[PDB]
Amino acid sequence: LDHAKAEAELAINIKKATSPEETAPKRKHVRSCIVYTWDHKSSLSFWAGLKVQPILADEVQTFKALITIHKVLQEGHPVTLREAMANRGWIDSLSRGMMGEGVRGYGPLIREYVHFLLAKLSFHKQHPEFNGTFEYEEYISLKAIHDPNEGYETITDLMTLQDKIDQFQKLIFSHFRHIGNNECRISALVPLVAESYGIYKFITSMLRAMHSSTGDNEALEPLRQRYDAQHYRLVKFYYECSNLRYLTSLITIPKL
Amino acid sequence: SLDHAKAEAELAINIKKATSPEETAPKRKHVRSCIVYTWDHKSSLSFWAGLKVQPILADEVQTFKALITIHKVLQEGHPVTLREAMANRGWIDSLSRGMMGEGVRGYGPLIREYVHFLLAKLSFHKQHPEFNGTFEYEEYISLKAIHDPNEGYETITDLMTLQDKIDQFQKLIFSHFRHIGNNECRISALVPLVAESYGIYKFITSMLRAMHSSTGDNEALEPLRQRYDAQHYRLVKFYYECSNLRYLTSLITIPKL
């Protein structure tokens, strides 16, 4: 069967994406996990595949699994987000540090990632119309007229998610050991840049759209103030990212 | 902005849906519509009047949800809302009295405590109209405290009193958590209390810091330092208990003290 071929191949992708190698999850295999969700309009074999891995024995393998999960939530078929809701309990179980076991010290990073991913899934449950990177043009195309009162509440939820990303990236930067490169730690910043920029772009477009063309727009000033605060804070994050040679080799850091 | 009569009619629908008997958080877009109304018309009078022809007191969940909605409108509405709220103190008080007791679902004590807190909040804003409803930080308030330390002392004391009200109320809300049910309606009241407590905390911290440099009288401010420390440790515990609530953390960032 070519069906059994497809299942066998995804199993290899998940395995190799979460190997013991202390670096970024192998891109071709993470890419193949993402593609699988689009090809079959289903992520069920992805979640099943991760559950049968020997990933809890090494905290690097657990951390690489969470990076892979994050990327698949971001870029996979929309159903991936829906099917992730049933796996909240399993995702929460990864926040342990049984084996690893703090020789390289990923425990705090694993707990912070699990907290973030559950917060991401909480948002997508509340706001199912979004895709994994909060695309504005995809979001606003689904209806003719959009409620600015829903828009206000949605932005404050996104800003709260932006705060979790900023806390998490700062924790990753603190864990950088001086000599000998931190490629696995730095690789987690790749989807965090994508997440934070996705949020930034949407809030920019939506907050602009909500402003009445003339008048003071007094009601939106709390969002403007928090938007500006998060902008300058995101500039600092992206400046620190642009000075990492390994991170800039993987992605283009947004300007802002 | 629409026709006045038609605008009040649409606001009535928002108030109705926000205060429905569904044991949930007040439906957020309708609470937002109530807040936005005050900015659009530069007046909260329609909101207060709209609440008067919305039956809520027969159902404890509706009454508690109404008090959450009132709290959010006081926080985020046009500044005139706080002034116009003063004439509705008697009515807010009436929501608790005509006593029920516990109630079937146990919102009775939470209702009475929310009314108690909201009256204390309005008492503060009457005495101290320089602040806004959400205690959005303004450095100017600490500058006033530098130049008028007698006034600053009294304002810090009153801020601390309001902080104690929030601490007592949040403790009561946590004690009424039930293992059956998502606790969303109860937890949706904690959200504005966390926001308000932090705003108060930032003001107390900055004003008390500013007053030590200006006056140089460590003996006179010692009671405020003693109370500050106590309230700090309480607030850490409050924010710690909130950190494990996933509905709350999805809506607001908990401060790290």
Author numbering:
A (entry chain B): 7 to 262
B (entry chain A): 6 to 262
Please quote the paper that reports this structure:
Clathrin-mediated endocytosis is essential for protein retrieval during neurotransmission and receptor recycling. Accumulation of the adapter proteins at the plasma membrane initiates the endocytic event and contributes to membrane bending. Complex formation has been observed between the ENTH domain of epsin and the ANTH domain of Sla2, the yeast homolog of human huntingtin interacting protein 1 related (Hip1R). Epsin and the phospholipid PIP2 are essential for clathrin-mediated endocytosis, and we show how assemblies are formed between the ENTH domain of epsin and the ANTH domain of Sla2 in fungi.
To understand why the ANTH domain of Sla2/Hip1R is specifically suited to bind the ENTH domain of epsins through the lipid interface, we determined the crystal structure of the ANTH domain of homologous Sla2 from C. thermophilum to 1.8 Å resolution. The overall ANTH fold consists of helices α1–α11 and is conserved between CALM and Sla2/Hip1R subfamilies. Through insertion of a conserved Tyr 252 and a hydrophobic residue, an extra α helix (α12) uniquely occurs in Sla2 ANTH domains, providing rigidity. A loop connecting helices α8 and α9 has a five-residue extension in Sla2, although with non-conserved sequence. Based on the low-resolution electron microscopy tomogram of the Ent1 ENTH/ANTH Sla2 complex from S. cerevisiae, these insertions point at the epsin interface. Moreover, deleting the Sla2/Hip1R-specific α12 helix impaired the function of the Sla2 ANTH domain similarly to mutating Arg 29, which is essential for the ENTH/ANTH complex formation. Based on the C. thermophilum Sla2 ANTH crystal structure, ANTH domains of the Sla2/Hip1R subfamily do not contain an N-terminal α helix. A crystal structure of the Sla2 ANTH domain from C. thermophilum reveals that Hip1R-related ANTH domains have two evolutionarily conserved insertions that contribute to the epsin/Hip1R interface to enable PIP2-dependent ENTH/ANTHSla2 complex formation. Especially the insertion of an α helix around Tyr 252 provides surface complementarity in the ENTH/ANTHSla2-binding interface, compared to the structures of the ANTH domains of AP180/CALM proteins. In addition, residue Arg 37 can toggle its side chain between the canonical PIP2-binding site of ANTH domains, and the ENTH/ANTHSla2 interface.
